[PDB]
Amino acid sequence: AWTQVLLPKIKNVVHELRITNQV
Amino acid sequence: ENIYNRLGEDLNKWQALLVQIRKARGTFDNAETKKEFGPVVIDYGKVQS
């Protein structure tokens, strides 16, 4: 059930794109 | 031109202020948009870009 949920409570993972010293 | 004349032929040409400028990138160029302090919030929103 967890696997098909990936594809059962799942935490939402989030990550960002930023820029620094122009990179 | 004033800077170039003032620091004519430094360590090589400047080599010094080009180091402290990167530190002067502080208070700046960060994900933070407004500096808080106590109940006074100073927001540098219009200038950040």
PDB file of C-alpha atoms in Angstrom:
ATOM      1  CA  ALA A   1       0.000   0.000   0.000  1.00  0.00           C
ATOM      2  CA  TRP A   2       2.851   2.388   0.828  1.00  0.00           C
ATOM      3  CA  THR A   3       4.535   1.554  -2.482  1.00  0.00           C
ATOM      4  CA  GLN A   4       1.433   2.237  -4.563  1.00  0.00           C
ATOM      5  CA  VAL A   5       0.954   5.445  -2.566  1.00  0.00           C
ATOM      6  CA  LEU A   6       4.433   6.430  -3.727  1.00  0.00           C
ATOM      7  CA  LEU A   7       3.523   5.464  -7.293  1.00  0.00           C
ATOM      8  CA  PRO A   8      -0.879   4.810   4.603  1.00  0.00           C
ATOM      9  CA  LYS A   9      -0.080   8.429   5.450  1.00  0.00           C
ATOM     10  CA  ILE A  10       2.989   9.764   3.635  1.00  0.00           C
ATOM     11  CA  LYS A  11       4.714  12.976   4.651  1.00  0.00           C
ATOM     12  CA  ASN A  12       5.137  15.475   1.822  1.00  0.00           C
ATOM     13  CA  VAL A  13       8.796  16.121   0.991  1.00  0.00           C
ATOM     14  CA  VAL A  14       9.658  19.417  -0.694  1.00  0.00           C
ATOM     15  CA  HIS A  15      12.959  20.948  -1.775  1.00  0.00           C
ATOM     16  CA  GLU A  16      13.793  24.199  -3.522  1.00  0.00           C
ATOM     17  CA  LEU A  17      16.009  25.608  -6.238  1.00  0.00           C
ATOM     18  CA  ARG A  18      17.861  28.778  -5.341  1.00  0.00           C
ATOM     19  CA  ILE A  19      20.869  30.743  -6.583  1.00  0.00           C
ATOM     20  CA  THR A  20      23.863  32.239  -4.772  1.00  0.00           C
ATOM     21  CA  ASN A  21      27.020  33.995  -5.969  1.00  0.00           C
ATOM     22  CA  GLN A  22      25.203  33.511  -9.298  1.00  0.00           C
ATOM     23  CA  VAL A  23      25.274  29.704  -9.150  1.00  0.00           C
TER      24      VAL A  23
ATOM     25  CA  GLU B   1      38.727  55.739 -12.261  1.00  0.00           C
ATOM     26  CA  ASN B   2      39.117  57.128  -8.740  1.00  0.00           C
ATOM     27  CA  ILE B   3      39.356  53.607  -7.311  1.00  0.00           C
ATOM     28  CA  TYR B   4      41.815  52.547 -10.009  1.00  0.00           C
ATOM     29  CA  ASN B   5      44.061  55.535  -9.320  1.00  0.00           C
ATOM     30  CA  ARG B   6      43.831  55.168  -5.534  1.00  0.00           C
ATOM     31  CA  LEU B   7      44.785  51.481  -5.557  1.00  0.00           C
ATOM     32  CA  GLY B   8      47.195  51.625  -8.484  1.00  0.00           C
ATOM     33  CA  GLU B   9      49.469  48.570  -8.349  1.00  0.00           C
ATOM     34  CA  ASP B  10      48.304  46.966  -5.098  1.00  0.00           C
ATOM     35  CA  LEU B  11      49.242  43.401  -4.063  1.00  0.00           C
ATOM     36  CA  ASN B  12      48.973  42.869  -7.754  1.00  0.00           C
ATOM     37  CA  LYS B  13      46.362  45.438  -8.826  1.00  0.00           C
ATOM     38  CA  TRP B  14      43.814  45.507  -6.016  1.00  0.00           C
ATOM     39  CA  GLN B  15      43.680  41.980  -4.516  1.00  0.00           C
ATOM     40  CA  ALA B  16      42.458  43.468  -1.230  1.00  0.00           C
ATOM     41  CA  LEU B  17      39.132  45.253  -1.695  1.00  0.00           C
ATOM     42  CA  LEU B  18      38.197  42.503  -4.136  1.00  0.00           C
ATOM     43  CA  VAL B  19      38.323  40.308  -1.022  1.00  0.00           C
ATOM     44  CA  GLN B  20      36.272  42.508   1.306  1.00  0.00           C
ATOM     45  CA  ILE B  21      33.649  43.137  -1.390  1.00  0.00           C
ATOM     46  CA  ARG B  22      32.646  39.475  -1.247  1.00  0.00           C
ATOM     47  CA  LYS B  23      32.143  39.965   2.493  1.00  0.00           C
ATOM     48  CA  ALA B  24      30.218  43.146   1.686  1.00  0.00           C
ATOM     49  CA  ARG B  25      27.830  40.850  -0.186  1.00  0.00           C
ATOM     50  CA  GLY B  26      26.531  40.422   3.352  1.00  0.00           C
ATOM     51  CA  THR B  27      23.346  42.122   4.518  1.00  0.00           C
ATOM     52  CA  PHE B  28      22.399  41.180   1.002  1.00  0.00           C
ATOM     53  CA  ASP B  29      22.025  38.378  -1.559  1.00  0.00           C
ATOM     54  CA  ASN B  30      20.317  36.057   0.922  1.00  0.00           C
ATOM     55  CA  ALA B  31      16.997  34.239   1.060  1.00  0.00           C
ATOM     56  CA  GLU B  32      16.017  36.634   3.849  1.00  0.00           C
ATOM     57  CA  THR B  33      13.953  39.554   2.566  1.00  0.00           C
ATOM     58  CA  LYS B  34      13.261  41.593   5.725  1.00  0.00           C
ATOM     59  CA  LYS B  35      15.542  41.998   8.735  1.00  0.00           C
ATOM     60  CA  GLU B  36      13.624  41.706  11.990  1.00  0.00           C
ATOM     61  CA  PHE B  37      14.801  43.107  15.305  1.00  0.00           C
ATOM     62  CA  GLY B  38      12.468  43.181  18.288  1.00  0.00           C
ATOM     63  CA  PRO B  39       9.240  44.863  17.192  1.00  0.00           C
ATOM     64  CA  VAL B  40      10.991  46.799  14.396  1.00  0.00           C
ATOM     65  CA  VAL B  41      11.074  45.058  11.023  1.00  0.00           C
ATOM     66  CA  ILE B  42      13.049  46.759   8.259  1.00  0.00           C
ATOM     67  CA  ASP B  43      12.155  45.235   4.898  1.00  0.00           C
ATOM     68  CA  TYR B  44      14.583  45.622   2.003  1.00  0.00           C
ATOM     69  CA  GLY B  45      12.060  44.431  -0.535  1.00  0.00           C
ATOM     70  CA  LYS B  46      12.231  47.158  -3.165  1.00  0.00           C
ATOM     71  CA  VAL B  47      16.042  47.097  -3.332  1.00  0.00           C
ATOM     72  CA  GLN B  48      16.809  43.369  -3.084  1.00  0.00           C
ATOM     73  CA  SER B  49      16.998  43.028  -6.871  1.00  0.00           C
TER      74      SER B  49
END
